C-alpha cells in the first residue's frame, strides 16, 4: 500500500497501517483515529 501511494499510483490509503519513521518520511499521515501498537495476546486461587 505504501509503495502504491508513493509512486503516484494512489493519492490516499484508507487501509489500516501503523506509523513509523520510514513510513512518515516518504508520505505524510493524518491524525490517527484508532489507537494501536505492539502487544502480546496469549492463551490461558
Amino acid at each position: 500500500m505504501i509503495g502504491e501511494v508513493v509512486y503516484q499510483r494512489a493519492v490516499m490509503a484508507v487501509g489500516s497501517l501503523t506509523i513509523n519513521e520510514e513510513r512518515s518520511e516518504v508520505v505524510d499521515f493524518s491524525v490517527p483515529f484508532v489507537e494501536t501498537g505492539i502487544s502480546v495476546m496469549v492463551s490461558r486461587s
Partner: protein, 87 residues
C-alpha cells in the same frame, strides 16, 4: 476449680459446637462467651463467602530476554511484511 486445668479447656472447647467432653455459678455467666465465638465464626464465614465470589506485561520480561535459557521453549512469532519486524 483449677486455674488452668478447666478454664483453658472450656475456653478452647466453646469455640466449636461439637464439644462432647465439656463440663458452679460463676462459670455459667462465663459460658456466654460461646455466643461471641459463634458470632465471630459466622461473621468470618460470611466474609469468606462474600470475598470468594500470563507474563510481566512487556518486553522487559526475562522470558523474552532468555527464551532458550528457561526449560519451556518459546516460539513467539510475528507477521512478516509488516511493521512489527521493523519495530
Amino acid at each position: 476449680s483449677f486455674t488452668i486445668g478447666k478454664a483453658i479447656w472450656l475456653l478452647w472447647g466453646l469455640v466449636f459446637n461439637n464439644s462432647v467432653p465439656v463440663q458452679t455459678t460463676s462459670k455459667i455467666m462465663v459460658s456466654v462467651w460461646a455466643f461471641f465465638a459463634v458470632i465471630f465464626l459466622a461473621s468470618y464465614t460470611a466474609n469468606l463467602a462474600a470475598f470468594m465470589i500470563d507474563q510481566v506485561t512487556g518486553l522487559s520480561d526475562k522470558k523474552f530476554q532468555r527464551p532458550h535459557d528457561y526449560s519451556p521453549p518459546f516460539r513467539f512469532g510475528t507477521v512478516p511484511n509488516g511493521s512489527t519486524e521493523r519495530n
